[PDB]
Design a protein around this motif. Sequence first.
Motif, PDB file in Angstrom:
ATOM      1  N   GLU A   1      -7.451   1.617  -5.780  1.00 17.28           N
ATOM      2  CA  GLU A   1      -8.758   0.890  -5.123  1.00 17.28           C
ATOM      3  C   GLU A   1      -9.674   1.930  -5.022  1.00 17.28           C
ATOM      4  O   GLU A   1      -9.545   2.974  -4.121  1.00 17.28           O
ATOM      5  N   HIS A   2     -10.780   1.787  -5.461  1.00 17.38           N
ATOM      6  CA  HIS A   2     -11.982   2.887  -5.560  1.00 17.38           C
ATOM      7  C   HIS A   2     -13.121   2.399  -4.836  1.00 17.38           C
ATOM      8  O   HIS A   2     -13.640   1.109  -4.865  1.00 17.38           O
TER       9      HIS A   2
ATOM     10  N   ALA B   1      -7.570   4.208  -2.458  1.00 18.39           N
ATOM     11  CA  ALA B   1      -6.211   3.979  -1.983  1.00 18.39           C
ATOM     12  C   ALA B   1      -5.343   3.566  -3.218  1.00 18.39           C
ATOM     13  O   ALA B   1      -6.116   2.926  -3.957  1.00 18.39           O
TER      14      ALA B   1
ATOM     15  N   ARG C   1     -10.977  -3.021   2.425  1.00 16.69           N
ATOM     16  CA  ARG C   1      -9.874  -2.306   3.352  1.00 16.69           C
ATOM     17  C   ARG C   1     -10.387  -1.460   4.527  1.00 16.69           C
ATOM     18  O   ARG C   1     -10.009  -1.415   5.461  1.00 16.69           O
ATOM     19  N   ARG C   2     -11.352  -0.488   3.949  1.00 16.63           N
ATOM     20  CA  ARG C   2     -11.850   0.313   4.869  1.00 16.63           C
ATOM     21  C   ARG C   2     -12.435  -0.555   6.311  1.00 16.63           C
ATOM     22  O   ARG C   2     -12.696   0.065   7.269  1.00 16.63           O
TER      23      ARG C   2
ATOM     24  N   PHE D   1     -11.539  -1.911  -1.962  1.00 16.25           N
ATOM     25  CA  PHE D   1     -11.456  -0.485  -0.967  1.00 16.25           C
ATOM     26  C   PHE D   1     -12.450  -0.606   0.314  1.00 16.25           C
ATOM     27  O   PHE D   1     -12.197  -0.100   1.419  1.00 16.25           O
TER      28      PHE D   1
ATOM     29  N   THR E   1       0.900  -1.279   0.011  1.00 19.92           N
ATOM     30  CA  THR E   1      -0.016   0.045  -0.125  1.00 19.92           C
ATOM     31  C   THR E   1       0.841   1.294  -0.063  1.00 19.92           C
ATOM     32  O   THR E   1       1.872   1.131   0.780  1.00 19.92           O
TER      33      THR E   1
ATOM     34  N   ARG F   1      -2.285   1.083  -4.578  1.00 18.07           N
ATOM     35  CA  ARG F   1      -1.705  -0.435  -3.986  1.00 18.07           C
ATOM     36  C   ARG F   1      -0.648  -0.391  -5.339  1.00 18.07           C
ATOM     37  O   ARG F   1      -0.843  -0.166  -6.355  1.00 18.07           O
TER      38      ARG F   1
ATOM     39  N   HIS G   1      -0.542   4.573  -0.462  1.00 19.17           N
ATOM     40  CA  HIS G   1      -1.279   5.487   0.142  1.00 19.17           C
ATOM     41  C   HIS G   1      -2.817   5.081   0.455  1.00 19.17           C
ATOM     42  O   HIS G   1      -3.293   4.133  -0.294  1.00 19.17           O
ATOM     43  N   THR G   2      -3.577   5.951   1.125  1.00 21.35           N
ATOM     44  CA  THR G   2      -5.022   5.560   1.563  1.00 21.35           C
ATOM     45  C   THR G   2      -5.532   6.902   1.975  1.00 21.35           C
ATOM     46  O   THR G   2      -4.970   7.765   2.811  1.00 21.35           O
TER      47      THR G   2
END
Lengths: 197, 197
Positions: B37-38, B17, B194-195, B191, B9, B19, B11-12
């Motif tokens: 990732e959206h 984010a 991930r969240r 995403f 990763t 990847r 950035h988030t």
Amino acid sequence: DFETISSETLHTGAIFALRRDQVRMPGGGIVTREVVEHFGAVAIVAMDDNGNIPMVYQYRHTYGRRLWELPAGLLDVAGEPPHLTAARELREEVGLQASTWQVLVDLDTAPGFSDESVRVYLATGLREVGRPQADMTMGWYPIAEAARRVLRGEIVNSIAIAGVLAVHAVTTGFAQPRPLDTEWIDRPTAFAARRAE
Amino acid sequence: DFETISSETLHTGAIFALRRDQVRMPGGGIVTREVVEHFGAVAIVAMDDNGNIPMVYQYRHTYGRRLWELPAGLLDVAGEPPHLTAARELREEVGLQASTWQVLVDLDTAPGFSDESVRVYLATGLREVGRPQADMTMGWYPIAEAARRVLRGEIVNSIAIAGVLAVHAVTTGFAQPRPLDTEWIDRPTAFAARRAE
């Protein structure tokens, strides 16, 4: 109006960079907007004498599968005119030379977070010259079939949507292709600027 | 086939984010693929009794100007069914309730570098309920006018391209809208995963 207040680079990579701006909303107010700066790309609807077009079947790491797309390529050669990139890409990707080139449709793929924009060409008067690969299959489709594949969700690449539907509107007499000198309003430039250097 | 070899990763942020994966090309071979990732998004073609649709005029930091787009919204509420997000967004953005909802077209906005995918709905049997803003103007367009605006480059948002052209193919009898249970093949999920967190 809106004004970039500050700006910072978070990442730079092979084909784009990620930037974070602070933007003054009018009037008073401050948002963070992240922009993925991209090179811009072109694609081609190559239409034979009978209404057929070529398409590639291209693996996309992002969806874990192959999509049906149009021949296309990044504006990754500095200063090279887009129309010349498109002719180049047509020959590299699908082994076609075309006599006549016109603007079909431009799109902004992801306005939400990228500058990327894409000029799609209509290329006609075609001749095969070889190199039709690596993992890319290609295949041809009558335009009407291609348009029904969009409408059934068999083609979902959004440059292929815009390209196939746009040419469909031309073949059914609804609209006209346009001259090469049509202004490309949102031609990207930020990432080419950054790369020069 | 292709296989993610490693992944990291970079950035988030608020809405996506970034990847970086290493992917095994078949057979033998290794590329770096970066994926933004959206959340995924939905948009609506709201078609009144007479063939008119609403559109918003939305400032896009990335192109430094406003575009004509369809009403739309991010899939940013965990687990919320997309069709319910679309109805919600229609009401928040343009002050419309609709009786009948059908799938019009799905697109993958930027296959090159994002997972983002977008389900566009056809919503019909409409009624105004209020909240038609902040900086967003909206306005209505007969569908045929909207389709000619695409073909003249007055509408370039690619979800608006796909949506307006798709509904144009419906109004001219070329294709049919589809049931809500049509599989959305490329619904994003990475995403949201991930969240959660």
